[PDB]
């Protein structure tokens, strides 16, 4: 799809059979969730945001589909607000900026 | 121009004389750039994402050029990590996600 930017870029994913609204975003490096079971070992990371950092848990090779796509990769899980597909899914399912 | 995401999207802007980076930001409502003096009056506001809330100063019908492409809105100026151009001036630059 072509997704212009004058409303939050809001998508359904579907991740461990649930479905989750995430925001499309260019400026997270990574992908990060709200606070879920997710399978197998977590390695600790902590990533910053405009405020300050928070520590997350990182899974590897963890499946979620963004829009009918299936990207599969690492996903954090953290204490996010809101559901962030970062750079490293969105290469995944071809996502560029365009103007 | 077509960006991919397999680096963070890092763009010149000319913003109060001053080349900046910044990163475009499809995740911001705002934007928002490091402490730099800037003409006008200006409001406080409070913005808040992961880690917590930060004090900006707020100045309104800022031009700004972003990669030639000319932009006038709100940018918020305080102690940002990273200079953010959020949705509110890339829609004004015809920015869209694409997959
Ligand atoms: C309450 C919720 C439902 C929402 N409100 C909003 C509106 N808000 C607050 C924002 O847009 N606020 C922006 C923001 O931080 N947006 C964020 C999404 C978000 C929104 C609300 C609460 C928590 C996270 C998303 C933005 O792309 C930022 C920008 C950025 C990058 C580096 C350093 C600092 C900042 N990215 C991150 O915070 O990424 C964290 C990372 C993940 N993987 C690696 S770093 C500001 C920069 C203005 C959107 S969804």
Aim: net charge positive.
């Amino acid at each position: 799809p072509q997704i212009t930017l004058w409303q939050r870029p809001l998508v359904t994913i579907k991740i461990g059979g649930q479905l989750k609204e995430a925001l499309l975003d260019t400026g997270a490096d990574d992908t990060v969730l709200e606070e879920m079971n997710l399978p197998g070992r977590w390695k600790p990371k902590m990533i910053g945001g405009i405020g300050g950092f928070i520590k997350v848990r990182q899974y590897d090779q963890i499946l979620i589909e963004i829009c009918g796509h299936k990207a599969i990769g690492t996903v954090l899980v953290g204490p996010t607000p809101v559901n962030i597909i970062g750079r490293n899914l969105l290469t995944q399912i071809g996502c560029t900026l365009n103007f």
